[model samples]
Target: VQQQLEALEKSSGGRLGVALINTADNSQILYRADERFAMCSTSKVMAAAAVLKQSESDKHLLNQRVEIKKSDLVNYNPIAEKHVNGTMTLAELGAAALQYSDNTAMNKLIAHLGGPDKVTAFARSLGDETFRLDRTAPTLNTAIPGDPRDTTTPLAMAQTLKNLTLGKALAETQRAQLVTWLKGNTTGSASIRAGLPKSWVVGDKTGSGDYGTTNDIAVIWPENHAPLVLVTYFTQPEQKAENRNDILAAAAKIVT
Candidate 1:
């Protein structure tokens, strides 16, 4: 694993961080796992968790319908564009936010959860200090001078996934739902999924940024062995998506 990671880092000319864990035995593989990297849409996982946590007290929250105005839509939001000027249950919004990585859908979730600070609080509640959501989605170009962008360390994200899978951060039912959404994720096919054998069932989230930032955090259920969690972050300011995807695929193959 170390050798492959070294080769990937060298090939990309970028910093790469990884954390892989075998759930059955709690064994781990780490490579620069503590380094922080821009999370981009991968932060949506925490946003969804925040909303799910809130729903425990407000049983009807997920079913409540929310209006999506034309102005509420943002760039890179295909789902929201299709549903603009319409109303959708919060559950539907959450699915779009997670499954499609729709920026507007995630923004609505952040607003519903009371804003970025609330989401960050939820992340901290999960015992992580490195995960921060300082801005809303469509964050690709939005910059607050000197303000931190959404970011998390590879180990932090891996731990978050562990907590979710182990029912530490969310109820079992909520965790199952979150897993379903993650399993149905449509945006990360070229990253982790591209690297694994077809028989593996992977629930994952992917993130991308303008420069050369590419990331994926996932729970993998191998065909007949123990489940594993893999988190990877790559930053190459000028690298292309395909190159980043290739690196992630290589990492996935190595860890599995």
Candidate 2:
């Protein structure tokens, strides 16, 4: 992987940062492990964790019903002509947030959880201080900037995943629920999962936007080795989906 990354760096003007770590041992970074970059949907991992913890503390079931309006569905997902104004369980909404990188679902979850400020408070209680949930779209139709909802660093993201895996912030059942939701997150094709052997179980959440930055953090359950935590962020590019996956592929080859 080093050879590949070196080659990629040479070709792409060294425009990316990738890092992988063994969460169980806290070893030094194994790749471009210390750089700061924008965290896209990876932020949702933290968001989901916070929400789950609250749900569990309140003895709320994952099946707790969450109703959605036509307005809420329009933020992150284009409402299908027919799929508007519906309700799903908290579990279902969380899954939708991850599985489809559904922005609308995420925002709805945030709002339902007492708005972004409350969510940010949850993140801090969990020791995720490097980032916050500050983004809030008013009127169900606009985007806000510098919102805690906006950015993240690789280190911060990896830490959230690590906390989930370690069961540090919640009970075993809550942790299980968090991991289950994250495992279903389905966005980003150019990072950690892109280069692994087909048999490996890669569970993670990915974040990207119209501006061309792609982010991902995941736990890789390899075929033979201990699970590894891989966090990545790519930005300042003229394109959205570029050779970013190649960078992650290279890291996978080296980390394993």
Candidate 3:
């Protein structure tokens, strides 16, 4: 699989990183899993997790109201654009951020978590040190060469995702909520999700950024087998290499 993945990466003309783990049996596959790649909106998953982390102590946290200022809206907001200057609960924002990749919803959740560093700290508390969030939306999409801000390795993120959704990071209820939102994701249909049977996927988060970045992290339920976590991150030298969905999909096909 690793050799095939290398071939696929070479053919795509992009640097690629991947990690596959079936925690049930501890089976793993990896390619550039330790290197950094732009996280883009995929970090929203962690932002949403931080929301649930607060809910554990603040029983009413998810229902807490937040005013969505027009100033909060940014380009490419799929869900929050409609609620500009209106109001939404933390639940709505979290779900929209994860399921719809809502830019404003993500910022609101990030702000609610006390900012990007808080989320990064929370991730550390969950046993991840390689994941970092150094900026907010749009700007975080810069994907600067040699810059580590707002970046995560494929292995680190897959481990974090497993911890939050499948491990002890969150209580059962919170884990269920996180799973529900990620499974409900509408933005990742074209990446790794494209290579597997739709029914086999339990949930996933997708992201994109400047310099030809495309990413997808997923927990898949392979029929009758234990669930597995798969993370893929891709990037090229050109910012215009924006849509590398097929690169991820092709990698998925080779790996799965």
Candidate 4:
């Protein structure tokens, strides 16, 4: 497994962080798992958790519709284009964010949770110190030089996913809802899920950014084997997306 992981990292031409765990056996296959990387859209998972956490205290919150304006629409958001200048329930917004990785929907969810500060706070409350949400989805295209963008370590992300899986981060019903949304995710077909057998189940989130930062965090159920959680990050400055996808596929094969 280590040899396969090393080869995948070598082929990436970029720094890679991985955390693969067998949940049934409590075994770890780690490589630089503590190093941080630009999380990009993967941070939406954290935002979704925050929303679910808030809903526990504020009854009827998820069903409330929020008005979305034309200005809410941003470039590179194909999934939310049809919903622009309209209103959607918070549940629908969360679905769009998780299922489609829609930037407009994610930003709307962020705004609903009171911006990036609250998102980060909720993450920290769950004991994820490395996860940070500093920018909204609309401003993701432009880097502010010295400012930090959304980021997390592979271990932190894996732990967050594990907590959600174990019903520690959200209530049982809320976690079930989040898991259902994740299972419905339609993005990043070329990443980790691409490497799996067709019958295996994978609940995951993918992230991408300029400069070769690509990531996927997933809980996978392989056929006739123990379930596992895999978090992979590629932080190379100029690697191609296909290359990153290949690396993740290789990693998935090893874990399975």
Best by TM-score: 3
Q: After superposition, how far is residue 68 of candidate 1 from its true place, in Å?
A: 0.7
Score candidate 2 by TM-score against the native.
0.82
Q: Ten consecutive residues with minimal summed lDDT in candidate 2?
A: 137-146
The global C-alpha lDDT for each of the candidates, from Candidate 1 onward, is 0.82, 0.64, 0.88, 0.79
Model 4 misplaced stretches (Cα beyond 4 Å):
141-148, 239-243
Name the candidate, 2 or 3, with the larger lDDT value.
3
lDDT: worst 10-residue window of model 3: 193-202
Angstrom error of the Cα, residue 244, model 2: value is 3.3
Residues 1-256 of candidate 1: C-alpha lDDT, one tens digit per residue: 7898898788777778899988888888999898767787788888888888888788988999989898998877878788877887889888988888888889888898888989888889889888888888776323222235777789888988888865488888888888999999998888898889998898998877755677889999889998889998777645344436778877888877
Candidate 1 structure lDDT? 0.82
Highest lDDT: which candidate? 3
lDDT of 1 at 180: 93
In the range 1-256, model 2's lDDT, one tens digit per residue, is: 6666667667754345666767557763634555455565666666677677877768766677766666655545632213466677777667777777777767767877777678768877878776655665323211123233455556766776777865487889888877776665566455667777878888877765543555667887777677787876655445333435556566566656
Give model 1 RMSD, 1 decimal: 2.2
lDDT-wise, the better of 1 and 2 is 1
Predicted candidate 4 versus true structure: per-residue lDDT over 1-256, tens digit per residue? 7777787778667777889878887788888898767787888888888888889888899999888788778765666778667788889888888888888888888888888989989988998888888898855523222236777778888888888865488888889888888878888688889888979888888877765667788888778887888898776654343336777777777766
